[PDB]
Amino acid sequence: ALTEKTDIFESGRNGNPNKDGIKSYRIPALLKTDKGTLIAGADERRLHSSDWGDIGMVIRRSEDNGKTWGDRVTITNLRDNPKASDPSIGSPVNIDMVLVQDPETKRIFSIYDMFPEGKGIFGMSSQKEEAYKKIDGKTYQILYREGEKGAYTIRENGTVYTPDGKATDYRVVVDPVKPAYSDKGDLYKGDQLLGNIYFTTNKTSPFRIAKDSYLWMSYSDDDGKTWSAPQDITPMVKADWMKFLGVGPGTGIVLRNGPHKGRILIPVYTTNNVSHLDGSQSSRVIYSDDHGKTWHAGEAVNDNRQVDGQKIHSSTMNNRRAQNTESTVVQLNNGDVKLFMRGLTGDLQVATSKDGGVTWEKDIKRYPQVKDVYVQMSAIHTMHEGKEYIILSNAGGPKRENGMVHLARVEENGELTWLKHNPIQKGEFAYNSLQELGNGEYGILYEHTEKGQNAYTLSFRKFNWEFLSKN
Amino acid sequence: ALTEKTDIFESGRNGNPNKDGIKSYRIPALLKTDKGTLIAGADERRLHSSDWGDIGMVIRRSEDNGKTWGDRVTITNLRDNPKASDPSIGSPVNIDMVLVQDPETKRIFSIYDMFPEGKGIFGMSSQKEEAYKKIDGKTYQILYREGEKGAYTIRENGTVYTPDGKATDYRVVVDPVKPAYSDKGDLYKGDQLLGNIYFTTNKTSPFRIAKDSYLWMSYSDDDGKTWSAPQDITPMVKADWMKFLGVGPGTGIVLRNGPHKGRILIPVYTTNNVSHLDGSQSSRVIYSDDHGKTWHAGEAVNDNRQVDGQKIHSSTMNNRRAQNTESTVVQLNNGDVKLFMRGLTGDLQVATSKDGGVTWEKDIKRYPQVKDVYVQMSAIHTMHEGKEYIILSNAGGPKRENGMVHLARVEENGELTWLKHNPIQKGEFAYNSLQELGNGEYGILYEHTEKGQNAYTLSFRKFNWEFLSK
Numbered sequence: 001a002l003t004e005k006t007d008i009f010e011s012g013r014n015g016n017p018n019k020d021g022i023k024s025y026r027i028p029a030l031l032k033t034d035k036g037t038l039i040a041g042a043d044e045r046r047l048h049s050s051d052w053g054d055i056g057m058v059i060r061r062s063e064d065n066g067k068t069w070g071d072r073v074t075i076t077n078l079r080d081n082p083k084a085s086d087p088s089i090g091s092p093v094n095i096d097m098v099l100v101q102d103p104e105t106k107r108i109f110s111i112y113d114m115f116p117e118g119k120g121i122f123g124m125s126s127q128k129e130e131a132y133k134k135i136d137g138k139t140y141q142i143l144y145r146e147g148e149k150g151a152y153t154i155r156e157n158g159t160v161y162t163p164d165g166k167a168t169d170y171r172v173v174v175d176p177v178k179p180a181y182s183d184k185g186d187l188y189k190g191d192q193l194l195g196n197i198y199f200t201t202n203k204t205s206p207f208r209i210a211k212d213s214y215l216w217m218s219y220s221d222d223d224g225k226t227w228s229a230p231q232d233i234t235p236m237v238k239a240d241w242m243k244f245l246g247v248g249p250g251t252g253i254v255l256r257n258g259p260h261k262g263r264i265l266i267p268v269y270t271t272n273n274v275s276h277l278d279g280s281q282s283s284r285v286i287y288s289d290d291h292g293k294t295w296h297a298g299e300a301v302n303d304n305r306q307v308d309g310q311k312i313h314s315s316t317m318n319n320r321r322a323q324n325t326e327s328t329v330v331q332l333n334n335g336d337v338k339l340f341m342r343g344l345t346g347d348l349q350v351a352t353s354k355d356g357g358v359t360w361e362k363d364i365k366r367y368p369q370v371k372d373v374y375v376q377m378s379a380i381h382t383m384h385e386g387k388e389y390i391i392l393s394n395a396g397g398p399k400r401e402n403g404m405v406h407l408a409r410v411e412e413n414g415e416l417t418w419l420k421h422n423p424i425q426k427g428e429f430a431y432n433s434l435q436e437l438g439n440g441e442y443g444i445l446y447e448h449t450e451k452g453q454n455a456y457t458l459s460f461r462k463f464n465w466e467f468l469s470k471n
Numbered sequence: 472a473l474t475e476k477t478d479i480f481e482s483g484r485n486g487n488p489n490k491d492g493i494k495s496y497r498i499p500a501l502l503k504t505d506k507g508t509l510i511a512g513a514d515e516r517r518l519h520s521s522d523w524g525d526i527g528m529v530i531r532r533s534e535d536n537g538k539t540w541g542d543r544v545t546i547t548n549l550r551d552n553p554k555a556s557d558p559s560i561g562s563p564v565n566i567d568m569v570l571v572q573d574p575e576t577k578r579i580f581s582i583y584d585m586f587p588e589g590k591g592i593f594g595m596s597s598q599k600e601e602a603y604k605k606i607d608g609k610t611y612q613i614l615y616r617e618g619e620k621g622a623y624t625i626r627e628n629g630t631v632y633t634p635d636g637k638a639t640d641y642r643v644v645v646d647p648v649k650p651a652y653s654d655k656g657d658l659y660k661g662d663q664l665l666g667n668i669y670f671t672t673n674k675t676s677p678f679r680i681a682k683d684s685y686l687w688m689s690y691s692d693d694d695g696k697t698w699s700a701p702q703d704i705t706p707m708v709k710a711d712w713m714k715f716l717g718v719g720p721g722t723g724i725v726l727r728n729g730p731h732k733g734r735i736l737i738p739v740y741t742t743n744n745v746s747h748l749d750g751s752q753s754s755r756v757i758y759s760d761d762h763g764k765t766w767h768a769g770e771a772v773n774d775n776r777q778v779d780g781q782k783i784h785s786s787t788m789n790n791r792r793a794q795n796t797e798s799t800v801v802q803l804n805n806g807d808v809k810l811f812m813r814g815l816t817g818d819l820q821v822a823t824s825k826d827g828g829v830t831w832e833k834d835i836k837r838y839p840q841v842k843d844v845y846v847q848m849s850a851i852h853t854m855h856e857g858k859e860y861i862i863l864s865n866a867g868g869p870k871r872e873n874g875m876v877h878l879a880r881v882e883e884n885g886e887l888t889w890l891k892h893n894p895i896q897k898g899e900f901a902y903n904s905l906q907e908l909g910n911g912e913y914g915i916l917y918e919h920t921e922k923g924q925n926a927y928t929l930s931f932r933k934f935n936w937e938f939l940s941k
């Protein structure tokens with residue numbers, strides 16, 4: 001009814017790197033594909049456990065439902081700045097992934113954050129730098145040149161254009177060829193490699209992108225075996241007011257019923273320039289109705305939300321306790337969308353959308369039955385049998401420790417009743433990603449440490465319904 | 472060389488309404504049309520001199536170079552909330568205009584601010600309310616209903632649609648017909664008038680627009696005698712981050728030379744939600760390249776500007792001294808665009824655009840030869856002999872007093888060499904608008920009070936080259 005842990009991504013120990021040179025793994029995502037393959041995603045955090053540095057977006061695959069796992073496949077790994085004074089912050093950053101498969105096209109998506117070199121979400125410029133320019137319908141990423149105010153642009157074939165629209169002899173690698181696409185952003189003057197547009201210190205080229213928060217996507221048309229080059233989806237979904245825009249890591253969904261069936265939903269969250277991480281973190285979804293081709297932002301749960309008798313908006317709020325951050329998303333059988341959101345109330349908060357995640361109902365339902373120590377969670381829809389349920393897993397607390405699996409009945413109303421709450425990992429426990437495996441079995445990939453392991457080792461267990469019923 | 476003043480818009484005296492029941496006139500705009508006509512526009516501030524209340528946008532015409540003047544024509548006057556507890560704040564507000572004529576189509580444009588009922592720029596809601604929604608390629612204005620979270624929309628024919636897209640029995644007057652378009656925004660159910668979508672207190676109807684800052688445009692195709700209904704240009708130019716977006720009052724320009732010849736430029740300024748009016752006021756222009764049909768926002772002077780060693784952006788800045796607000800715009804013969812901006816440095820701040828006002832060069836030039844007491848100004852291009860010059864008019868100081876006309880020579884590289892500084896009005900002097908008349912003589916419509924007049928009475932004077940040259 002509950003297996004022993006199988007370590008999928010093993011961290012080093014006692015502050016040293018592991019055999020592969022990697023100190024740390026974080027941020028699990030678990031996906032069961034149509035071929036019944038399991039894909040386990042993670043941040044490969046080479047130098048340290050923090051939310052920056054040299055981080056690879058990696059997966060392993062299991063073709064026997066979680067028993068054995070293949071070699072690490074690197075989706076994206078941007079090259080470090082070799083001239084960086086501090087290598088700990090000396091790399092363009094990718095962090096936090098969401099996995100989802102399109103049930104129709106079979107195409108698998110990994111959506112993840114990107115930052116240029118520096119400290120990620122803790123190292124964003126205090127003043128806005130414009131990141132994109134629309135020139136005659138077409139949107140181009142801007143480049144800033146050493147000692148100049150104007151916006152250069154990256155146009156077709158990566159040709160750098162001057163602020164007043166003349167081709168230069170500078171080229172950006174927009175179609176990277178190297179393993180894990182480490183050549184992405186490389187800046188050339190004709191045939192000479194000069195540097196990289198994602199480097200921000202001790203640069204050997206004239207050009208850098210805006211110091212901002214970006215959102216990238218890579219896909220696989222062969223069950224996770226190979227991956228496309230990164231697609232920059234930021235300009236489709238990020239408004240000019242948004243400071244940070246990033247994924248709520250884990251596994252996204254495709255809507256299975258209602259008038260929006262087929263819609264891909266990816267949890268994200270933003271901050272604003274009024275209060276940033278202190279009081280503006282706000283959950284929402286981005287979505288696609290054309291099988292991952294184009295993406296749109298839905299509204300935030302916090303948009304026109306009533307809080308302490310006054311209305312807030314995600315773009316302007318400064319309310320620590322009204323924040324909702326990383327979230328996990330589930331569609332019910334009655335068409336509704338539930339968003340379970342990390343937050344600061346000490347218990348679970350849940351928003352409901354009736355239009356397929358575009359807008360959210362007036363009230364956030366809180367559930368004191370499920371604690372929330374302010375850490376990521378995952379939740380999936382399950383049938384048993386045929387009564388409707390939701391499985392949710394997160395830290396039991398008091399801190400990031402004692403991993404719990406929670407079971408709720410979904411009432412024919414759309415309401416939820418919490419029934420059973422079962423420990424699944426004693427000791428350290430943080431992020432996790434649940435999946436349905438079939439025949440009453442469920443998989444979980446999660447963050448844990450023991451015997452001096454660096455934060456974190458990512459381990460996998462299976463369980464069945466009998467595990468869930470314990471009281 | 473300098474005529475005595477002709478009062479064009481007369482304010483009340485001693486805190487009382489004038490003979491028309493108007494306490495105050497503010498915010499001159501002066502427009503010399505193709506026909507020779509002078510159009511003097513103003514805020515007609517009925518109840519008090521403050522930046523809110525019951526205000527009409529009004530003009531008077533002169534066909535004899537300012538000697539005689541016709542009757543006031545009211546461009547727009549939104550009706551007051553008849554149920555407001557405090558009438559001094561109980562009206563939807565129009566405030567601050569910019570006039571300009573298209574030299575090709577001859578169309579005259581009045582661009583001005585609009586707020587729903589309340590205290591204008593001084594009563595803006597702390598949190599964002601989204602004002603517009605795009606649905607299937609179309610942008611619709613949003614309505615909010617008491618007790619509901621979702622966005623109603625004003626669609627085709629003014630029919631109100633529910634958050635989820637059904638027609639209701641409600642409709643808005645989107646094509647107003649009453650004098651001064653005082654019916655604009657009226658909320659009907661069937662043929663029963665219920666209230667107004669611009670009303671924000673003691674409402675008799677279920678619906679209101681977002682409490683935000685809007686930009687409206689009305690146009691004349693008959694030398695300013697009659698005017699179109701207001702056109703809401705906000706969604707074309709206002710980004711989601713902007714809090715306030717409003718005009719820099721006076722008279723805008725059409726570019727006469729260079730790659731962008733024919734571009735209509737209108738000075739505006741924004742605030743942001745980080746620091747609002749304390750640290751974010753930022754000049755820029757909006758513009759039209761198709762004769763005022765569609766409008767675009769240029770970048771702010773403050774966008775990627777270096778201030779005390781550090782880059783700022785108009786959307787994120789919190790810097791009182793690096794603010795720039797109302798401005799006046801001039802195109803030089805070499806094609807450069809100069810923007811003279813009201814600021815907090817004591818002297819004249821000037822920005823330069825090399826691309827027809829879309830982006831601005833890295834330095835703001837300060838000219839200590841011209842004092843700025845933090846008050847609006849106007850400035851125009853003029854050819855004499857013909858050498859290229861700029862005339863700028865504002866207050867000399869130390870307060871809003873002693874009006875000046877300034878002459879600068881514009882050098883081939885666009886640098887300004889200030890030649891002459893001649894006083895034009897003793898005591899009270901605030902906003903003003905300059906025009907070229909022809910000989911050349913030069914007109915100035917300005918704010919000034921004497922003899923217990925309420926702020927302000929708006930008076931007109933002519934002056935010629937030899938007055939400037941003193």
Ligand SMILES: CC(=O)N[C@H]1[C@H]([C@H](O)[C@H](O)CO)O[C@@](O)(C(=O)O)C[C@@H]1O
Binds near residue numbers: 027096121277325326
């Ligand atoms: C992009 C990014 O930084 N993601 C990280 C977030 C954010 O820092 C917080 O959500 C900010 O509130 O949280 C973690 O630090 C955490 O709680 O373990 C890890 C995660 O990778």
Ligand SMILES: CC(=O)N[C@H]1[C@H]([C@H](O)[C@H](O)CO)O[C@@](O)(C(=O)O)C[C@@H]1O
Binds near residue numbers: 498566567591752
């Ligand atoms: C829309 C509006 O309120 N306009 C008004 C401005 C602004 O309040 C300030 O520029 C804000 O900083 O200032 C005046 O009061 C002024 O200085 O005489 C008059 C003007 O009509």
Ligand SMILES: [Cl-]
Binds near residue numbers: 197202205
């Ligand atoms: Cl570089």
Ligand SMILES: [Cl-]
Binds near residue numbers: 665667674677678
């Ligand atoms: Cl009403």
